[PDB]
Every structure is written in C-alpha cells, then in structure tokens.
Amino acid sequence: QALLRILKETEFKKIKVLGSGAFGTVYKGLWIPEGEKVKIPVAIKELREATSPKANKEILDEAYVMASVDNPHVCRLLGICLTSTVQLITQLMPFGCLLDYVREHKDNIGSQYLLNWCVQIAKGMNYLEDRRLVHRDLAARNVLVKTPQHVKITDFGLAVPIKWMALESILHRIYTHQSDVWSYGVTVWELMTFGSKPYDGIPASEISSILEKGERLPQPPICTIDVYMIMVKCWMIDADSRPKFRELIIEFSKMARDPQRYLVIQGDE
Numbered sequence: 001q002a003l004l005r006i007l008k009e010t011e012f013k014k015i016k017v018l019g020s021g022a023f024g025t026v027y028k029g030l031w032i033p034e035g036e037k038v039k040i041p042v043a044i045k046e047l048r049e050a051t052s053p054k055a056n057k058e059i060l061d062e063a064y065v066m067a068s069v070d071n072p073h074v075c076r077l078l079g080i081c082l083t084s085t086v087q088l089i090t091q092l093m094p095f096g097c098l099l100d101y102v103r104e105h106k107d108n109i110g111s112q113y114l115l116n117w118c119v120q121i122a123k124g125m126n127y128l129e130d131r132r133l134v135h136r137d138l139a140a141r142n143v144l145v146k147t148p149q150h151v152k153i154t155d156f157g158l159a160v161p162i163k164w165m166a167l168e169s170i171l172h173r174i175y176t177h178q179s180d181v182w183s184y185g186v187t188v189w190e191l192m193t194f195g196s197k198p199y200d201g202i203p204a205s206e207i208s209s210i211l212e213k214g215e216r217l218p219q220p221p222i223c224t225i226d227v228y229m230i231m232v233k234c235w236m237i238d239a240d241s242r243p244k245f246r247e248l249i250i251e252f253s254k255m256a257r258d259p260q261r262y263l264v265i266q267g268d269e
C-alpha cells in the first residue's frame with residue numbers, strides 16, 4: 001500500500017557490491033516485496049555508521065521526502081530497512097553511474113546520446129526545483145543509467161566537492177537552485193570530456209581564487225563554441241544571471257535535433 005515500504009531483512013538480498021563512498025556502500029540485489037511474488041532488481045545502500053533511534057527519525061523524515069519523488073529523470077526511494085546500519089532500497093539502474101559509463105564506453109558514444117543526457121539531467125533538476133529541493137551535490141557520479149537512452153539523478157538526499165560548487169557555495173555555503181545550475185555546468189563538462197577530472201591536479205584550496213580571476217574549465221575538444229557558451233553561462237558569478245533549468249531544457253533540446261552540428265565526434269556522421 002505504502003509510498004515508502006518499511007522492509008524486513010527476509011524480503012531482500014545483496015547479490016554484488018557496486019561501490020562505496022564516504023557514507024555507505026551500494027549493492028545490486030533482489031527484493032520480493034512482502035505479500036508479493038515478483039522479484040524486483042534493486043540497489044541497496046547500507047550506511048557506513050550505525051545509527052540510534054533518534055538519528056533514525058531524521059533519516060525517516062528525509063526518506064519520506066525521497067519516496068515522494070516522481071519523475072522519469074529522478075530516482076525514487078522505494079524502501080528502508082531500519083537495521084543497525086540502515087539500508088535504503090531503490091530500483092536498480094543496471095548500467096551504473098553515468099561518470100563510469102562515459103569513461104568505459106567513450107568510443108561508442110555519439111552526439112545524440114550526450115545531448116539527450118544533458119536534456120534529461122536538466123529535466124530531473126527542474127523537477128527538483130519545482131519540488132523546492134536543492135541537490136547540493138550534482139555531478140556525473142550522481143547520475144545513473146537505466147538504459148543508454150535514459151538517465152536519472154540521485155543522491156540529493158544527503159544534505160567536499162569544491163570543484164563542482166558555485167563560487168557563492170565555496171565562499172559563504174549558500175546553496176540554491178542557481179548554485180545547482182553551476183554544478184550542472186560542471187556535470188555537462190564531465191560528460192563532454194568523457195569523464196575527465198575538472199581543474200585536474202589543482203588543489204581545492206585554490207579554486208575560489210581561480211574563479212574570482214575569471215578562469216573557467218576549458219572548452220572540451222568535441223564541443224562547438226555554442227555548447228561551451230551554455231557551460232560558461234552556468235558559471236556566471238551572478239547566480240540570478242545563470243540560465244534556469246527550464247531554459248537549459250529548451251537549449252539542449254534544440255541542439256539534440258541536429259546533434260552533429262553541436263558536438264564533433266569522429267565516426268558520428
């Protein structure tokens with residue numbers, strides 16, 4: 001019945017580890033919902049630290065919000081298991097994170113895929129804005145691949161990635177939908193460089209000073225200047241001058257109609 005299912009351990013199992021971050025470990029698994037027969041492929045995130053009943057109330061309040069997300073380009077929380085180390089269940093995104101996907105499939109990715117991913121990520125971020133949800137950690141690592149044609153945003157349920165942060169976030173810990181636009185621009189740069197490292201080899205402590213001098217990430221080799229200009233707009237110092245997600249959907253959708261006019265990839269005729 002319930003929007004957020006409160007799971008028993010007997011209902012699911014871990015099959016394969018997928019990755020670990022600072023706060024938890026993600027597994028591919030299987031869930032048979034209590035009272036049902038069907039086997040659902042899931043991702044299971046187990047938190048690194050054990051939590052108290054008090055801490056679990058803060059988790060539950062956020063988990064209900066995460067279960068309320070309903071958009072084709074945003075991952076929804078399906079369930080929670082209140083084990084000592086809490087476990088969080090979503091539908092499995094079988095192709096993993098988009099960062100790894102573009103690094104591992106670089107030779108078989110054309111302009112149409114890249115521009116459609118930019119549209120879809122903008123659509124998911126626009127829904128979050130409509131829901132008054134600030135992501136605060138948008139990056140290619142936090143976009144998942146359902147199919148090569150269908151990506152979804154995740155890991156916004158977490159409220160230091162200095163190299164993805166808007167200048168105002170670095171200087172004053174101000175986070176808004178418009179600082180998410182800055183991070184969107186970095187995410188697009190990641191895609192267009194097939195998962196390269198932003199501000200590579202430069203210490204995080206230097207980034208605010210580089211940005212204050214007007215320096216920005218470089219134009220990727222595949223990008224026409226028209227695409228680079230969208231990234232540049234996302235990195236304007238005045239937050240309210242940056243594009244809105246709705247505007248980014250329009251502009252990337254136009255480019256996706258003639259994708260080889262906007263990204264130049266060898267073999268992508």
Ligand SMILES: O=C(Nc1nccs1)[C@@H](c1ncn2c1CCC2)N1Cc2c(cc(C#Cc3ccc(CN4CCC(CO)CC4)cc3)cc2C(F)(F)F)C1=O
Nearest residue numbers: 043044045059062063066075076077088089090155156157
């Ligand atoms: O579930 C998540 N990812 C998954 N991937 C695959 C399967 S599930 C992602 C996620 N974010 C948005 N979405 C998702 C999935 C669907 C959309 N989330 C939601 C998520 C996560 C984490 C926590 C946590 C935590 C936590 C809290 C307190 C302490 C103790 N320490 C607090 C700090 C304090 C220090 O002062 C001391 C006490 C510890 C941990 C909660 C949630 C949420 F929202 F469910 F309540 C997390 O990662």
